[PDB]
Coordinates of C-alpha atoms and ligand atoms in Angstrom, one line a residue:
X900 CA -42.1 -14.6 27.7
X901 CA -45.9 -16.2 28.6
X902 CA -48.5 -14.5 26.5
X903 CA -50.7 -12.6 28.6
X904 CA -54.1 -12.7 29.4
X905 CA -55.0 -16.1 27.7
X906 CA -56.5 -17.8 30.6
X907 CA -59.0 -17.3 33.4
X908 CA -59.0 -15.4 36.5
X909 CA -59.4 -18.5 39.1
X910 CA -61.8 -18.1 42.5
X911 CA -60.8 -19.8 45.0
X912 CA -63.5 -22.2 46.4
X913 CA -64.7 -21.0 49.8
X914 CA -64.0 -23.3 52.4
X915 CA -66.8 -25.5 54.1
X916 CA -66.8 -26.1 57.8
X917 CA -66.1 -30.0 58.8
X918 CA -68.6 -29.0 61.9
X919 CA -71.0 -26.1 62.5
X920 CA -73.3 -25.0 65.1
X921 CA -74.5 -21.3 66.4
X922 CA -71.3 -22.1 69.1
X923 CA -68.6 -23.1 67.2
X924 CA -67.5 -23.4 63.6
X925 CA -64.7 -26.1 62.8
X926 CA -62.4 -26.7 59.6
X927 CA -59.3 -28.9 58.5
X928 CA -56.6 -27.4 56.1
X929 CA -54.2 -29.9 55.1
X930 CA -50.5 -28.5 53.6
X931 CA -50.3 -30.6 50.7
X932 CA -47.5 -30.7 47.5
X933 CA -49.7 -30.8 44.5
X934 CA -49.4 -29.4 40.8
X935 CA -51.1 -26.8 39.4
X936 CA -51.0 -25.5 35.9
X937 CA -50.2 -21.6 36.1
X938 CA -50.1 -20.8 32.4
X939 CA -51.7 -22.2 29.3
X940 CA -48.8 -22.5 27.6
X941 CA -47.1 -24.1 31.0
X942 CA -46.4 -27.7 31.8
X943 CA -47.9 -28.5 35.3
X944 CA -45.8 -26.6 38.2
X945 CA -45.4 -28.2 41.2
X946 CA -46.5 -26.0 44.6
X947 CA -47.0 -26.5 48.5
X948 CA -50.8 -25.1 48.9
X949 CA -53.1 -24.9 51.6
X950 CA -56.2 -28.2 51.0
X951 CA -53.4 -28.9 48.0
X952 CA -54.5 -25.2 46.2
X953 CA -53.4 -22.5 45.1
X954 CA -54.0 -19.9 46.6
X955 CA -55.5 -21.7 49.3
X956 CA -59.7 -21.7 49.9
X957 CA -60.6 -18.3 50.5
X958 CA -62.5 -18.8 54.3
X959 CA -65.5 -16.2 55.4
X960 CA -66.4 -16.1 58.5
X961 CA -68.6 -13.2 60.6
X962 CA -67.7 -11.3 63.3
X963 CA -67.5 -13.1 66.5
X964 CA -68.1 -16.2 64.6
X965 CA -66.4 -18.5 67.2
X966 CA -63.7 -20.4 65.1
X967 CA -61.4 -22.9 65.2
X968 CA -58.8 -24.0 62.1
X969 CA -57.1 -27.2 62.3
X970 CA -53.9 -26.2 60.0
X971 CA -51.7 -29.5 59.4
X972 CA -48.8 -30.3 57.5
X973 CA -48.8 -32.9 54.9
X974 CA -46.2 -31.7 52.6
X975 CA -42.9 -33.9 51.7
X976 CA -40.0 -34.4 54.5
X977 CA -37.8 -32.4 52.3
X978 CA -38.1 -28.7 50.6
X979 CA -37.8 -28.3 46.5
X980 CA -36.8 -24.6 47.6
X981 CA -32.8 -24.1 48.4
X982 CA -32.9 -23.7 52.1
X983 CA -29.5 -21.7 53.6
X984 CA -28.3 -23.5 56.8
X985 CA -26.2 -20.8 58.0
X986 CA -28.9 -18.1 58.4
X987 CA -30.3 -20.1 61.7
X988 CA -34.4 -30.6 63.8
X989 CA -37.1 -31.2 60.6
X990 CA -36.1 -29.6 57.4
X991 CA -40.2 -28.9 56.8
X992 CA -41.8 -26.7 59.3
X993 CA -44.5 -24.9 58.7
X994 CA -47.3 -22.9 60.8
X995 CA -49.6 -20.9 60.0
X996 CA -49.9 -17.3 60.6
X997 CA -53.8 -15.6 60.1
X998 CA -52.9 -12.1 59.5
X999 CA -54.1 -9.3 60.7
X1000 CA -55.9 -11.8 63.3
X1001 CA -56.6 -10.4 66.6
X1002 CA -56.1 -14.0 67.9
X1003 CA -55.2 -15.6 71.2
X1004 CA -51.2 -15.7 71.1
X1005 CA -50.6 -19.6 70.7
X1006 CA -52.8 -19.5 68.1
X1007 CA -51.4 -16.5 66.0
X1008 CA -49.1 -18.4 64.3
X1009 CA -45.6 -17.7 66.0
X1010 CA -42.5 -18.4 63.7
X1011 CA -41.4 -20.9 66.7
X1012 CA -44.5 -22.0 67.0
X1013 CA -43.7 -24.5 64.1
X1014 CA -44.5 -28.0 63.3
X1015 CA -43.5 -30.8 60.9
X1016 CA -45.2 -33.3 59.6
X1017 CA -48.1 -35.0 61.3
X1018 CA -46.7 -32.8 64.3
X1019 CA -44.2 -35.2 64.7
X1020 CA -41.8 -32.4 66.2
X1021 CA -42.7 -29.0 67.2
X1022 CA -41.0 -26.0 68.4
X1023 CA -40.4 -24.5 71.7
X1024 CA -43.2 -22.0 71.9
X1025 CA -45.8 -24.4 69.9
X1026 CA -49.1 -25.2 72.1
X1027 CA -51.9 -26.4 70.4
X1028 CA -53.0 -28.3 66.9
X1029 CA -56.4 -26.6 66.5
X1030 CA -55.8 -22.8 66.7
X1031 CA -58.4 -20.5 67.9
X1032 CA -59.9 -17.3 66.2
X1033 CA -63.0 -15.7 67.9
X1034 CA -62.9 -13.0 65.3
X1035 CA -63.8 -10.9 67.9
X1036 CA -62.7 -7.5 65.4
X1037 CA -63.8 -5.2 62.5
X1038 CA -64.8 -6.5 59.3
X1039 CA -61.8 -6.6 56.9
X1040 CA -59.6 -8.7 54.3
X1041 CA -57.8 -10.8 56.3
X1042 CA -54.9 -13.4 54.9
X1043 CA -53.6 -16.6 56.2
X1044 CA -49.3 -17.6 55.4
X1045 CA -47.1 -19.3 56.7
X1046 CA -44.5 -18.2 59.2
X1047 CA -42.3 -20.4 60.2
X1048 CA -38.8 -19.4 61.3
X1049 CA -35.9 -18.5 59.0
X1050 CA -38.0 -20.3 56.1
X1051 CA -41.1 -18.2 55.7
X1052 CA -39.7 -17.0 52.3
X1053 CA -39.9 -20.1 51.3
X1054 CA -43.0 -21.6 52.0
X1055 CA -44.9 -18.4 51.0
X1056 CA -42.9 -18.5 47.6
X1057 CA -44.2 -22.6 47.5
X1058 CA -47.9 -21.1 47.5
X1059 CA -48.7 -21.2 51.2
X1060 CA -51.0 -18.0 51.0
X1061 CA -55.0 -17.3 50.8
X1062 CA -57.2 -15.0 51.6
X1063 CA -59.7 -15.0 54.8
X1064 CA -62.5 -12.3 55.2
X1065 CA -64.6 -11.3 58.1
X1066 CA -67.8 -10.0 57.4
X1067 CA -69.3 -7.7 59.9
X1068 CA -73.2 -8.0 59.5
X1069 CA -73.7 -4.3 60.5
X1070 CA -71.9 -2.9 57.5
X1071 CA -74.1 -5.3 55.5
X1072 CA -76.8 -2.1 55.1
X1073 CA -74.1 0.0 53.1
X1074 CA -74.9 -2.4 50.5
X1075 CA -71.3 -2.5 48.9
X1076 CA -71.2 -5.6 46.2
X1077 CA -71.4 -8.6 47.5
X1078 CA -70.7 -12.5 47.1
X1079 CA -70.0 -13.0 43.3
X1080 CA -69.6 -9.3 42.6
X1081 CA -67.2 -9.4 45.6
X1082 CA -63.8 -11.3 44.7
X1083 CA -60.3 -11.8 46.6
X1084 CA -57.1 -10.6 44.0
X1085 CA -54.0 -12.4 45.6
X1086 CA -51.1 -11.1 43.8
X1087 CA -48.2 -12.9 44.2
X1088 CA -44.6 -12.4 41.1
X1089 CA -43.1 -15.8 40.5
X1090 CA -40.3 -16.8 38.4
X1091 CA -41.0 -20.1 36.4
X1092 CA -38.8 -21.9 34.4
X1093 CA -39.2 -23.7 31.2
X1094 CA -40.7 -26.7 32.4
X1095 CA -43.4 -25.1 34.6
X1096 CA -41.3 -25.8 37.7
X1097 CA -40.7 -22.8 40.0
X1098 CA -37.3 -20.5 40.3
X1099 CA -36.0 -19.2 43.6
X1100 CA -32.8 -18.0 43.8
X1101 CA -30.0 -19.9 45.6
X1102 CA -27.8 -17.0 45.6
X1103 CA -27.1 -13.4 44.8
X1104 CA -26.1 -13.3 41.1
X1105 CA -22.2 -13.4 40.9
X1106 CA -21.6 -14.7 44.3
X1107 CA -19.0 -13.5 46.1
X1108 CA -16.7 -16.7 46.4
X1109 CA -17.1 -16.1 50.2
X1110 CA -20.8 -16.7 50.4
X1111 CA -22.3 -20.6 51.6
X1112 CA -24.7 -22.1 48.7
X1113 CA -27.6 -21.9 49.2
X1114 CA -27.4 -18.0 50.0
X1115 CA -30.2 -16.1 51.1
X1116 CA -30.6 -13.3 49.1
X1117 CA -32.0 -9.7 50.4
X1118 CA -34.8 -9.2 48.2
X1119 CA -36.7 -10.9 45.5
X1120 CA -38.4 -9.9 42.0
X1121 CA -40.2 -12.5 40.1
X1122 CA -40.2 -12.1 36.6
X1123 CA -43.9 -13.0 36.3
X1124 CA -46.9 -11.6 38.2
X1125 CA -50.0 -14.3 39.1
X1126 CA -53.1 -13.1 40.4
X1127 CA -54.9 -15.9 42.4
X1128 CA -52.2 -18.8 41.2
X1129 CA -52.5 -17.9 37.4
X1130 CA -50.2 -15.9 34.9
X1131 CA -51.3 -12.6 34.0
X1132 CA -55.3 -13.7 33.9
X1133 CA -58.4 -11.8 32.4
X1134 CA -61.7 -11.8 34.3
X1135 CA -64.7 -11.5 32.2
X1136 CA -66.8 -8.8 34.7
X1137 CA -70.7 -7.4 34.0
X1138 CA -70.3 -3.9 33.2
X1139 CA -71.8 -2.7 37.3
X1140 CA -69.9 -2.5 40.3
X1141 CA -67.5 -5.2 41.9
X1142 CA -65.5 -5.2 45.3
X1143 CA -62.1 -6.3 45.6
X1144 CA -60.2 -7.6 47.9
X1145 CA -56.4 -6.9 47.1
X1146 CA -53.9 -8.8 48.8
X1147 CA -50.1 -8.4 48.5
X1148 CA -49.4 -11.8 48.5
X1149 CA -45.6 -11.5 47.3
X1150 CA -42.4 -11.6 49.0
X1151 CA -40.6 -8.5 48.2
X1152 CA -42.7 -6.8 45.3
X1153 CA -44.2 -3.8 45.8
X1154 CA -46.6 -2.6 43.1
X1155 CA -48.2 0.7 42.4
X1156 CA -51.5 0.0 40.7
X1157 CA -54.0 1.8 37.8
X1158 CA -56.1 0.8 35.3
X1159 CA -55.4 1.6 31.9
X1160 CA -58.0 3.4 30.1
X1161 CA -57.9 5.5 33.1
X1162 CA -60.9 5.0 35.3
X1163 CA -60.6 5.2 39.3
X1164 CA -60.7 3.1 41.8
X1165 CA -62.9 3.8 45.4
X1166 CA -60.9 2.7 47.8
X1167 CA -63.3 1.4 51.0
X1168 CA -61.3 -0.5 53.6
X1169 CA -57.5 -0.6 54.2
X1170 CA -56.0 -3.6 56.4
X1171 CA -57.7 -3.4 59.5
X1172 CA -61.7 -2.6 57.9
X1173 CA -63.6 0.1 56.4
X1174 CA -62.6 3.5 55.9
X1175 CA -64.4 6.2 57.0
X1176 CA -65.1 7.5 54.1
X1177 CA -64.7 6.1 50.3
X1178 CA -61.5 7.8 48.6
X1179 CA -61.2 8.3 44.8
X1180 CA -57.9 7.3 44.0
X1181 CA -56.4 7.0 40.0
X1182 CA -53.7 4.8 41.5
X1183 CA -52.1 3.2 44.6
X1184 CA -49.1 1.3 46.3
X1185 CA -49.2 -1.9 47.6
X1186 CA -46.4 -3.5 49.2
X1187 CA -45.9 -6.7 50.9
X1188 CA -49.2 -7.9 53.0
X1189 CA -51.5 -4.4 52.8
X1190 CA -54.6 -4.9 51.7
X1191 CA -56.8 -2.4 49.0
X1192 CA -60.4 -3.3 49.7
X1193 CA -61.7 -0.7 46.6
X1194 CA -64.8 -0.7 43.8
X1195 CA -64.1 -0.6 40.4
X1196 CA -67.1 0.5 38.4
X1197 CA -67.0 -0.9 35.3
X1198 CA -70.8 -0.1 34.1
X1199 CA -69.6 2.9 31.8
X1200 CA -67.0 0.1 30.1
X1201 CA -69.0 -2.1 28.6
X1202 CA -66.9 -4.0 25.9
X1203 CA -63.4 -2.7 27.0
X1204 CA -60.2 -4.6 27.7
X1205 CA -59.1 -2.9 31.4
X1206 CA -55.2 -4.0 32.3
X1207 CA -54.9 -3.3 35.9
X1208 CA -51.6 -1.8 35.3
X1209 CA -48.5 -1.4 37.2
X1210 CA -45.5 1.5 37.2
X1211 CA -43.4 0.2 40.5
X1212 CA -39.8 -1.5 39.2
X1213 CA -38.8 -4.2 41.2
X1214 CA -34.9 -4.2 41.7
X1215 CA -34.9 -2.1 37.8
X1216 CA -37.4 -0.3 35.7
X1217 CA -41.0 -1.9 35.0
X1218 CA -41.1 -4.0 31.6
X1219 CA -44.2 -2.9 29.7
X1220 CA -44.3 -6.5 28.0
X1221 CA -43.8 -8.1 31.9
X1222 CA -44.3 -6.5 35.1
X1223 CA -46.0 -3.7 33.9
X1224 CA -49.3 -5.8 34.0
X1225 CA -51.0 -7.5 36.6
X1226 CA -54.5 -8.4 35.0
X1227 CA -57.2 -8.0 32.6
X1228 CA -60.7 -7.2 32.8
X1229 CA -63.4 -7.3 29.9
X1230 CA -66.4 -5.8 30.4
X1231 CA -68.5 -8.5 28.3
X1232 CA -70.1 -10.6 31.0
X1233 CA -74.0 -10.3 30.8
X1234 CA -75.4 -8.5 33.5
X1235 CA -76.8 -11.5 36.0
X1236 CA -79.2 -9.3 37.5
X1237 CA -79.6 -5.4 38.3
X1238 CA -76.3 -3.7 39.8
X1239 CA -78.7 -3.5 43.5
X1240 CA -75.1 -2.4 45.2
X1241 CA -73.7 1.3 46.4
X1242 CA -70.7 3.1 46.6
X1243 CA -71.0 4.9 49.4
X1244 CA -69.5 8.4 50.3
X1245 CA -70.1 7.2 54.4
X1246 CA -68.7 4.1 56.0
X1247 CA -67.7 3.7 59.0
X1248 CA -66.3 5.7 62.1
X1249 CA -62.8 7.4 61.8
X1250 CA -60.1 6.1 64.2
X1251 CA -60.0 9.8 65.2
X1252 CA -63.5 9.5 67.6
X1253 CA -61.0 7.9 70.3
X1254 CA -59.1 10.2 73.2
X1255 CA -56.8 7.5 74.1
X1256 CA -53.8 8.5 76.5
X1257 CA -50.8 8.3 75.3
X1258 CA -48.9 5.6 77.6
X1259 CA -45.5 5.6 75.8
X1260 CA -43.4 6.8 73.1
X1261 CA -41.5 3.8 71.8
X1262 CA -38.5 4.7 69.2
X1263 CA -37.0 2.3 66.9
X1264 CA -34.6 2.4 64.5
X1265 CA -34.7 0.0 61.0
X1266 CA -30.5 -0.6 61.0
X1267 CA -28.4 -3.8 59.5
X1268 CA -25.1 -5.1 59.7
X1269 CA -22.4 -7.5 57.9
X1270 CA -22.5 -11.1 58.8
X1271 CA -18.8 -13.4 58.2
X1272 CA -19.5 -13.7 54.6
X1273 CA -20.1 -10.0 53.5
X1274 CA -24.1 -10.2 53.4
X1275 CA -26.4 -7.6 54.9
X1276 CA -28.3 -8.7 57.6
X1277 CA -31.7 -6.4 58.6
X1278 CA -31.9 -5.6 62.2
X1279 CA -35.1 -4.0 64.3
X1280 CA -33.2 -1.2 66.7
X1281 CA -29.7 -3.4 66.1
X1282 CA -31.4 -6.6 67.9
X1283 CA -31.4 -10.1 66.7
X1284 CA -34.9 -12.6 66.8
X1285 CA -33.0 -14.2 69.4
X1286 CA -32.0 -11.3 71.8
X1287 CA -34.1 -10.8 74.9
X1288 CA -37.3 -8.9 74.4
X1289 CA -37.4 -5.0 74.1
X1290 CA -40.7 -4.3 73.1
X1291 CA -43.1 -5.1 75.6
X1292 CA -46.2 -2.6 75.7
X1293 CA -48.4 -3.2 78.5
X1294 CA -52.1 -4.6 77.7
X1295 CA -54.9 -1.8 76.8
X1296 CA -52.5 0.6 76.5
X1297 CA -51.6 3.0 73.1
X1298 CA -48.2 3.9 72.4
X1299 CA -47.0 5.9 69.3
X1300 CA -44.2 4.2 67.3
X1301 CA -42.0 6.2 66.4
X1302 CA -40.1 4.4 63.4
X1303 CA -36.8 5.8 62.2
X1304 CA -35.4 4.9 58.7
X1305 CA -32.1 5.6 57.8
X1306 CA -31.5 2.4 54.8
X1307 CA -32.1 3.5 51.1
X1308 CA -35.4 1.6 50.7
X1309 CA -39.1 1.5 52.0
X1310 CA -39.9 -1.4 54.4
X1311 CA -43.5 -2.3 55.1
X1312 CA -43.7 -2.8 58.4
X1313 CA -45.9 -5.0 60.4
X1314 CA -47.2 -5.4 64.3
X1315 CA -49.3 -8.4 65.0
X1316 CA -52.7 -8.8 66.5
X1317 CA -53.3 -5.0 66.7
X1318 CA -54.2 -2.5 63.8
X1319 CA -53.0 1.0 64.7
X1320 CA -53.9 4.6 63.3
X1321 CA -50.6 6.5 61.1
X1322 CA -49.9 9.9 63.0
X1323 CA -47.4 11.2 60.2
X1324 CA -44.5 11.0 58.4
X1325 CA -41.0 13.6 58.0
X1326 CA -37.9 13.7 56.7
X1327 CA -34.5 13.7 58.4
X1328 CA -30.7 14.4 57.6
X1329 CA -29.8 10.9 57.0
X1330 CA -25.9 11.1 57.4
X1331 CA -26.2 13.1 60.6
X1332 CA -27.9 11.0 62.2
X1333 CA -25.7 7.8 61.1
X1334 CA -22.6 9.8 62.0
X1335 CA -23.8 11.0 65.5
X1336 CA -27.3 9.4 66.7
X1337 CA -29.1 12.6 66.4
X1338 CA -32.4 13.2 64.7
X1339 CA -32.5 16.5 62.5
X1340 CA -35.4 17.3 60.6
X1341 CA -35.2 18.4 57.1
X1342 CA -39.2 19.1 56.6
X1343 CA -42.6 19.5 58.4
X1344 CA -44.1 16.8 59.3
X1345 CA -46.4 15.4 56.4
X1346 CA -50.1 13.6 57.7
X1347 CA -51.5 10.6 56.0
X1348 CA -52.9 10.5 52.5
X1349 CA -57.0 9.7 53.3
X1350 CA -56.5 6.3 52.4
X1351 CA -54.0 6.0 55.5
X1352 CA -57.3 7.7 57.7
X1353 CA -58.8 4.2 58.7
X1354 CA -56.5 1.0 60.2
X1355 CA -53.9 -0.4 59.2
X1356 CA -51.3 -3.3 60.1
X1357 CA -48.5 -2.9 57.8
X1358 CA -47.5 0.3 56.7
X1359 CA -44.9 1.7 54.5
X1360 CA -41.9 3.4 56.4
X1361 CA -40.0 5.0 53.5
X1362 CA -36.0 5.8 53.7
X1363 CA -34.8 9.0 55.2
X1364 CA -38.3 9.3 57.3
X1365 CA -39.7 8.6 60.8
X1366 CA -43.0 7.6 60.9
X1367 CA -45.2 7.4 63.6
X1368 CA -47.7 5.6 64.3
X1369 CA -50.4 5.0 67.4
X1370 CA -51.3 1.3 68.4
X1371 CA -53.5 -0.1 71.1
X1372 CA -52.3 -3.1 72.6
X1373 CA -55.0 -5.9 72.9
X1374 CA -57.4 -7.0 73.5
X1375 CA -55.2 -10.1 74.7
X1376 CA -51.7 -10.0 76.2
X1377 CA -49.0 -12.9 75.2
X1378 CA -46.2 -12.5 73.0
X1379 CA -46.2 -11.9 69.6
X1380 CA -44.1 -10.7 66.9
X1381 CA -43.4 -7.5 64.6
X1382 CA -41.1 -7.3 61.7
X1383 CA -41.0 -6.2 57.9
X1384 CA -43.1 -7.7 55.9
X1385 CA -40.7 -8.4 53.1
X1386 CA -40.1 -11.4 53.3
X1387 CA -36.4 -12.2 52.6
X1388 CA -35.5 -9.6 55.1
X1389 CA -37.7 -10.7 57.9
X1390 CA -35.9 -14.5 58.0
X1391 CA -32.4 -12.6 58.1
X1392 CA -33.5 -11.1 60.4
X1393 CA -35.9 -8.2 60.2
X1394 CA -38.3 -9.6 63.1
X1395 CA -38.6 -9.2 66.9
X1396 CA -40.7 -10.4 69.4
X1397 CA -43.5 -8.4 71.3
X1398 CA -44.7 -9.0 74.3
X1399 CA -48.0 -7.6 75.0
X1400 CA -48.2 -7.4 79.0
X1401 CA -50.2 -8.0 81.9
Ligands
PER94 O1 -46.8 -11.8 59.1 O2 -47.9 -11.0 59.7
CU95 CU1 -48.5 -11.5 57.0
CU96 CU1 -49.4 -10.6 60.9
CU97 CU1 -37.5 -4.6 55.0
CU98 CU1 -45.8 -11.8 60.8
OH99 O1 -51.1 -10.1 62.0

């Protein structure tokens, strides 16, 4: 297998406006296929990526910067990815999704809001070319993908990912580290072949003589892990404080993080922004599209070799020589300047300081079925994309969620536009309630960990619990989407849409 940590953390470049003013702010992103090399020992791998990169330019913005992101495709008329026909026109569509956006609704990105090339064709609820996002919302680590229906797997697996972070200038006094001690980690597994070209699976190993080829398959591990497009890297760091901005960038891998020689990491800010207050943690789990916004304090490590390390198995145990590791850090980088940066104990206000009524108690149950050729197909409350609407919240309102679990596995589930507060978690008698419908409680209810204190927008519902959470719905209305956030179950067909209402 590759040899780790032989090459180079990359930063991505942060992208420059094409047009600025105190109004507005205007940039072009162009999908483009283009060939990266993501290993030393690699030949060049050709990738779909964002400005023809990968990871796409990391974008910064402040908020209520008024912005506006031309996102076009550019990418060949035909996929390198095996695309299954019979899970759902252009072969190539493609639109771009800005998650955890609190965006106007034709500009959120909406799986049938697709385009192809040039925007030759477009889908039925597609609106605009330039899409809109007055960032009018907390600081936080933000992401951009793409979402287009029955093929987001796909082009995220191709590279369409990168990070977007809005800075709000009045958390600018808490002095946390900043530009380069500040640095996006997009982690994102990958299997490569031997010529540098990337594997996705076109079926489940030992098909079933029943199932089409290309098959969709219900979950994907990658026998590699990249951070920010390269192979297991190392980042030279100063031995002081850095930020980090961890983004889930993969499509079904979860990973449950530490460092090696044992230090901590200060967790800050979860999806939606700042905690309110720093939490000490030795380790965490990240599954698809949450975000870790911690310090690691690396000024009593000068010298050392740091693997961020990971024990979460992906479909098996971890391999120590594989997907045990993510990265590297070396503390050997001279200091550029005095560490002038804090960790804080006090950040920002808890959720908690709002009394808003509850308006409605919304149950849903995470269910599945069979499709004609044996597969498992993952259903929100036993609906399809494509049946009419269910979830329709009224605007300015909260509701709790509560989401009921009854599969074998966690599912990281994800509401747009909105980031909501976690209420609790508890178990229930799993077979009795498959049997008859009815909920039975094997437990108390459990609260959230204090890194589940702040706001999130995709959160971890684990099997045999109902978890609830508390969402307010705004500040627009228009319809929008929420589904798990693994990928291969949210094209077949893990997703719903929401309709926020007037
Ligand atoms: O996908 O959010
Ligand atoms: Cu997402
Ligand atoms: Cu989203
Ligand atoms: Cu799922
Ligand atoms: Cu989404
Ligand atoms: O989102």
């Amino acid at each position: 297998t590759l040899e780790k940590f032989v090459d180079a953390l990359p930063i991505p470049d942060t992208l420059k406006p094409v047009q600025q003013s105190k109004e507005k702010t205007y940039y072009e992103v162009t999908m483009e296929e283009c060939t990266h090399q993501l290993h030393r020992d690699l030949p060049p791998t050709r990738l779909w990526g964002y400005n023809g990169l990968f990871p796409g330019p990391t974008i910064e913005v402040k908020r209520n910067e008024n912005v506006y992101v031309k996102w076009m495709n550019n990418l060949p008329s035909t996929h390198f990815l095996p695309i299954d026909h019979t899970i759902h026109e252009p072969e190539v569509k493609t639109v771009v999704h800005l998650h955890g956006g609190v965006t106007p609704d034709d500009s959120n990105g909406y799986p049938e809001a697709w385009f192809s090339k040039d925007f030759e064709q477009t889908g039925p609820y597609f609106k605009r070319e330039v899409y809109h996002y007055p960032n009018q919302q907390r600081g936080a680590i933000l992401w951009y993908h793409d979402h287009a229906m029955a093929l987001t797997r796909l082009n995220v697996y191709a590279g369409l990912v990168g990070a977007y972070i809005i800075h709000d200038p009045k958390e600018k006094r808490l002095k946390l580290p900043s530009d380069e001690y500040d640095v996006p980690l997009l982690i994102t597994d990958r299997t490569i072949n031997e010529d540098g070209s990337l594997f996705y699976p076109s079926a489940p190993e030992n098909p079933s003589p029943s199932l089409p080829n290309p098959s969709i398959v219900p979950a994907f591990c990658g026998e590699t892990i990249l951070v920010n497009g390269k192979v297991w890297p190392y980042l030279e760091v100063e031995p002081r404080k850095y930020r980090f901005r961890v983004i889930n960038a993969s499509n079904t891998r979860t990973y449950n993080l530490s460092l090696d020689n044992g230090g901590d990491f200060i967790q800050i800010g979860s999806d939606g922004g700042l905690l309110p207050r720093s939490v000490k943690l030795n380790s965490f789990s990240l599954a698809p599209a949450e975000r870790y916004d911690i310090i690691i304090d690396f000024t009593a490590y000068e010298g050392e070799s740091i693997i961020l390390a990971n024990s979460a198995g992906c479909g098996g145990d971890v391999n120590p020589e594989t997907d045990a590791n993510i990265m590297q850090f070396r503390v050997t980088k001279p200091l550029a300047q005095k560490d002038e940066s804090r960790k804080p104990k006090y950040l920002a206000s808890y959720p908690s300081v709002q009394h808003e009524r509850i308006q409605n108690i919304r149950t849903l149950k995470l269910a599945g079925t069979q499709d004609e050729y044996g597969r498992p197909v993952l259903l929100l409350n036993n609906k399809r994309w494509h049946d009419p609407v269910t979830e329709t919240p009224k605007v300015g309102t909260t509701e709790i969620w509560s989401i009921i679990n009854p599969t074998r596995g966690t599912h990281p589930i994800h509401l747009h536009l909105v980031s909501f507060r976690v209420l609790d978690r508890r178990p229930f008698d799993i077979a009795r309630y498959q049997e008859s419908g009815e909920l039975s409680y094997t437990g108390p209810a459990v609260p959230p960990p204090p890194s589940e204190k702040g706001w999130k927008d995709t959160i971890q519902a684990h099997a045999g619990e109902v978890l609830r959470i508390a969402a307010t719905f705004g500040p627009y209305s228009g319809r929008y989407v929420w589904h798990c956030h693994i990928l291969e179950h949210e094209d077949y067909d893990m997703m719903r849409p929401m309709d926020i209402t007037d």
